[PDB]
Each structure stands twice: as C-alpha cells, then as structure tokens.
C-alpha cells in the first residue's frame, strides 16, 4: 500500500494499512455469530422437507408474512415526527454499504 | 461482471454506454485539441477499442445508431 | 439458473413455497422466485458458506462514484479536465443534469412503460432506478459533485481533472457522513442508544474492523417498515401535482420514465420533504404495495419483500432472534409470556409462537421489527444494538473519516460542519422552500419549512491552494 496517500481508493483497499482488504469491495462479509445451516455448512433451513430447526418445523416465509406482517392499507398510521425523506436516506445509505450479489439467469 | 438481484440484470460492464457516443464526436471534431483526444483514445483503448473504427463498431454491436458516423 | 420461471428447488434456486389459503396466490403449485446469494468459496466441503459484499463498507459515497475502477471511470466525464461526473446526453430536468442511461441487455425500466422507452439509469450503485425517489437522491448528489468541482476549478485554475474529481468526491463523501451521523442515526436509534453505541468520536483506531457483518444486511432492512404505499409529488406551492399526485408504488418500481417525462426530481423531493413516513406498529408492519405487488410490472409474479427478507436470512445461515438477543446482552425469552413481556404485546407473541414454536427460531428481521420502538427512535433494543454497533465500526475503523487528523484542515472541518441536506436541495434544484431544523423530522408544509435564502452555502475558501 502507498505509505503516503491523499484520497481514498475507489475499491476501499488500503484504508486499513495492516489488513488492506478490510472494507474493500468483492470480499466476504464478516460474521458476528457462526452460521446456522440445515447441514451445518451450506443448506438453508427450510431446504429439506420435514427437517426441523432446533426441535420445531421451519415456518414458510410467506406464511409468517401473511400471519404477522399483513394489515389493511387504508388504516396506515402516519409518523408525526419523520418525513418520508427519513425512509429514502436509509435506502440511499444502505446502497453505500452493501450489495449481496446473486447469480444471473 | 454482471450485477444481478431478484433475477434482474442491473448492470453489465461489457456494454457500450450512451454518453460515450458524445466522446466519438469529440474525436471526430477538427477543433478539439490533441490532449483532449489523447485522453479519450487512452480511455477507449483500455476497453480493447484501439482505433476509431473499433469504437464506432462497438457502439453499433450494442444497439446504438451510428449512421452519422458513416 | 432458471430460478425466474421454475418452482423446482435445485441450486442456485430456493423458491418460497405458497401456504394454504394464501390471500393472493391461490395456485399452491406456483412459488415466489428466489436465487441464493453467491457463496464466497464455491464448491467447498471445508468452509462454512458465506456471502460477498460487492461494495466498499465505508460511508464514502460509493453509491455515486462506484466500488470498482472500470465502473468509476465509466461514471466520469472524460471529454475535459473539469473533474465532472458524466450526465444524460438526451434529456435534462428544466436545464439541469440527469443521471446517464445504462445499457442492459434485458432492461427492466423499459417494461414499466413500453411506449416511453426510457431505460434504467447509470450510477455508483446498480439499484439507482429501483424507485424514482431513490433516483432523485442519486441525481441530487451527481449535481452536487459537479457544482463542487466547478467551484473548485474557479478557485484553483491550475488543478487538473483528476485533482478536481478527487477533491469534490472527498467533500461529497464527508457530506454523506455528516448527514448520516449527525441527522439520520440519532433519529433511528434514539438518544439512549445513540450515546451507548456511538459515543463522541476520539480518533481513527486501525484495530477496529470496518467490514459489514452479514447480519447488518438483513437487520438494516427495518426501513421497509417506513415505506408508504404511494409516490407523492407536489408542485412549487407544495400542493398535489395536477394528474396522479399519489401513484401506487407497484407502478413506480423501475419507472425511470416518470423522472424524465413526468416533471423531473423537484416534485419527488418536495413529496419526500412534506409527506410523513409510515410508522412501524406491531400490527401494521409493512404495506401490501411491497408485500403483495413488489416489482409486478417487470416480473411474472409480484414478490413479497418481508418474506424475501426472512428467506434471505435463512439463505445467509443467520442465527435466530434469541441468539442475536444474547449477542447484544439482552434477555432471551423462552415462553409465550416471556416473549409478550419483551414485546409489551402478548397477542403478537402468541402469533409469533404459533408460527415459530420457539423465540429461538424467529427470523432476525421479523423479530427485530416486532420489538417496541425506543424513545425518539424507530428501532427496538435488538436492532439498535446491531445497527449501532455496525455504524460505530464504520466511523472508528475509517482512516478517511472527516474528523480524523490529517483528512481535512481544522478550517475545512469548520466549513463542512455548516452543510445540510436542505441546502444541497437548494443548490441543485428549482426548489426555493425547503425543510427546517432536521430534514428527517420536519414533515408538514408550511409549518416545518423555510426559504433557501435563510440557509448559508458551503464556503470553499479553505480549499484554496495558491
Ligand atoms: C481500538 O479498538 C479496539 C477494538 O474495540 C472494539 O470495537 C470498538 C469499535 C468498540 O466497540 C470497543 O468497545 C470494542 O472493544 C480495542 O481493542 C479491544 O479492546 C478490548 C478491551 O481491552 C479487548 O477485550 C479483551 O479481550 C480479551 C480476549 O478475549 C476476547 O476475544 C475472545 C475471542 O473472540 C472472546 O471470547 C472474549 O469475550 C473477548 O472478546 C479478554 O480476555 C479481555 O478480558 C478482560 O476481562 C476483564 C473485564 O471482564 C478486564 O478487567 C481484563 O483486564 C480483561 O481485559 C477483554 O475482553 C478486545 O479484544 C480488543 N479488540 C481488538 C480487535 O484488539 C482497542 O482497545 C481500541 N483502542 C483505543 C485506543 O481506543
Ligand atoms: C424505496 C422502496 C424499497 C424497495 C423497493 C426495496 N427496499 Fe430494501 N434493503 C435494505 C438493505 C440493507 C438490503 C440488503 C441489501 C444487500 O446487501 O444487498 C435491502 C434489500 C432489498 C431487496 C433484496 C430482496 C431479496 O432478499 O431478494 C429488495 C428487492 C429491496 N430491498 C427493495 C435496506 C432498505 C432501507 C434502509 C433503511 C430502505 C428505506 C429500503 N431498503 C427501501 C426499499
Ligand atoms: C462533459 O462536460 C461538458 C461541459 O459541462 C458537457 O457539455 C455540455 O453538455 C450540455 C448537454 O449535456 C450542453 O447543453 C452544453 O452546451 C455543453 N457544454 C459544453 C461546454 O460543451 C458534456 O456533455 C459532458 N459530457 C458528459 C458525457 O457528461
Ligand atoms: C407512458 O408514457 C407516456 C409518455 O411517453 C405517457 O403518455 C403521456 O401521457 C400524458 C398524460 O398526462 C399525456 O398528456 C401525453 O400526451 C402522453 N404522451 C404521449 C407521447 O402519448 C403515458 O401516459 C404513460 N403510460 C402510463 C401507463 O402511465
Ligand atoms: Ca461505500
Ligand atoms: Cl453475522
């Protein structure tokens, strides 16, 4: 890494001089807890029919959404103390921090 | 080098961009200075496009109209 | 990879199955499409599967400039030494710059209006066209970089294009850090959590790891609970814009034609400023415009964003709710009654226990958004901990943090402390009346608004090199 620098690299490389890829693009995420997979290392919970997670059947994501998340739109509670700009700055900020690639068709 | 999410290709680095057609006009302008054209030819050669024919041909392959450059 | 049309579960597809008696999808043989995130080490029986971050974790405005050298150069105007970002060459917004168009082989923006033929935009991040409100903010920062580079050229005439580009990129990045940490994050976390997870900055610490944790990518999707079901556009008097002032969100996703052909970014920014955000409540979590009709115009079926969030946490092998509560030093409920006390809502706890069986298996997004909101905050204790911890690491572990010694002079730091998002709106739009105090709290016109003459412009005098 150059021992003198005035500007950030575009890729984020060299920000940390001791470990130059920390924060740089196209690198694995850091994990705060070890991953929990159906087979221990790659298959997601809900992959194999009948296989339980920690003693319980895996709830279909759409079923959870239909039972807990669903509500009548015309009853929406407006936030008195937040502008819709508060929502939008968050997504613009999220797009500065992370993009998880997935394979193209 | 294909940015995909939810099955939608959101970006492809290989494709020619529309605003790069304005750079072809500068390279063909007899009043543009040499240093200006030198930076644009360096920019295009780094994408594998060495000659002006290559630049117009890449714009054509990727859907842009290049009739004005005939 | 036929995950877009096939409901067969083969890698890399992991389709969401349809439950019985679903309110919208009556065909139980159909599914909601889903592609598993790319693994960092493909075909491996040694490493525990992890996912990739295609961006820089730093708050460095990479959604404007890019996170890879080839895209970053493509975003620059290479026809001169002014250090500007490239702009749209066919369309302008009342004489102002628009983002350049991108060239995609299958463009989803063209599917929103087949007669308009307005493709997706090109920006530092590839999702800039996801909703016209996001496009309006990307366009705003594109104009801000060009305005700054123009002002620096007038001050330092001997500076070349690379120097002007880098000096404006440095200011735009610092502005994003200032709006985020000063105005935004205290309104997400509340005062208690803001003091707890983000104490007063001291200096750069090279031992602080600045990477995004895999859990943050799902936890930060709490913002989906703030989404309103319409796009609001207001005129120069902050009154509903002539035809279609409240457009259903299922008709704005990827609708870049609306920016170009329906009035530009001013009506969209005024709607963002003078419309309230949706309030997340325990029995009003997320609107049907994203739970039933997400991207339905550009796809075979409308997706369900909250369900995509839960399926994504399982794709990423994230631990459940109690493991994340334990990580945070928060109590972990075992029974329905204990979950009811933590949520201060026994009816929601009963529903969650009927779906998950145990608070150990509750998906991180579902459990996190279920928690009651902290005082003057819009997240509960669990999400305050994850978000708060992440943003402290992005600030303390960033060698180019705007307050770090050597990044800016003391005089440039004093000048940067005067910036605000309403003033950036003043500088780069036809808007002359903008929001008061904190733009993220102000939400009612005219009560919370001021004229642009009241706000000072950023003073670049300390950037002079004689
Ligand atoms: C520069 O930042 C460094 C990182 O700081 C962390 O992140 C920032 C953003 C803040 O959130 C901050 O609060 C974080 O700590 C920072 O270095 C860190 O300093 C702490 C405190 O000295 C270190 O903790 C000690 O760790 C050892 C080793 O065990 C740890 O790792 C294992 C394995 O992962 C875990 O299982 C353990 O739970 C620990 O996490 C412990 O043995 C030690 O125990 C202490 O026990 C009692 C209190 O219970 C004390 O009386 C003793 O004296 C012991 O110290 C600590 O828990 C931490 O490891 C270290 N991290 C790194 C990355 O080096 C540094 O101090 C900052 N410097 C400045 C100038 O700000
Ligand atoms: C403006 C309307 C809006 C739409 C449409 C939207 N979001 Fe998200 N969203 C995220 C984060 C973080 C992710 C994960 C991003 C990543 O790492 O790829 C995400 C992921 C998604 C994904 C990927 C879904 C999947 O798992 O397959 C879609 C689609 C999405 N959001 C749509 C933070 C937000 C925030 C932050 C407060 C807001 C506001 C927000 N999102 C508003 C929106
Ligand atoms: C590079 O910068 C120049 C100068 O800002 C741009 O040229 C202007 O383009 C607009 C339309 O886009 C015209 O109305 C102006 O008259 C032009 N001015 C000059 C001095 O040429 C140029 O378009 C930019 N290139 C890109 C790709 O954005
Ligand atoms: C698709 O986009 C076109 C514009 O390209 C829209 O057509 C315009 O609609 C307005 C309505 O106020 C008319 O005043 C214009 O005359 C129309 N323009 C043209 C060229 O026809 C059209 O409305 C859009 N379609 C949808 C579904 O909104
Ligand atoms: Ca970034
Ligand atoms: Cl994690």
Numbering used by the authors:
A (entry chain A): 167 to 271
B (entry chain E): 33 to 102
C (entry chain B): 279 to 744
The paper states:
The heme enzyme myeloperoxidase (MPO) is the most abundant antimicrobial protein and contributes significantly to oxidative killing of pathogens through hydrogen peroxide (H2O2) mediated formation of highly reactive oxidants. While rMPO is a single chain monomer with low heme incorporation, native human MPO is a ∼150 kDa dimer with each subunit consisting of a heavy and a light chain formed by posttranslational modifications, which are linked by disulfide bridges. In this article, we present the first crystal structures of the complex of SPIN-aureus and a truncated version (SPIN-truncated) with mature dimeric leukocyte MPO showing full heme occupancy.
The MPO-SPIN-aureus complex crystalized in space group P432121 with one MPO dimer and two SPIN-aureus monomers per asymmetric unit. Overall the crystal structure of the MPO–SPIN-aureus complex is similar to the previously solved complex with rMPO. Gln37, the SPIN-aureus residue closest to the heme cofactor, is 3.2 Å away from O1D of the heme propionate, a distance where a weak interaction is possible. Importantly, no direct ligation of the heme iron is observed. His43 is the only residue of the conserved HDD-motif—reportedly essential for inhibition—that directly interacts with MPO through a salt bridge with Asp380. Interestingly, we found that large areas of the MPO access channel, corresponding to the less hydrophobic regions in the interface between MPO and SPIN-aureus, contained crystal waters (8 within 5 Å of the N-terminal domain). More stably coordinated waters (green, wheat. and blue spheres) were observed around the propionate groups and along the most likely access channel (blue channel). Three of these coordinated waters need to be actively replaced by SPIN-aureus residues Gln37 and Asn38 (highlighted with blue circles in Fig. 4).
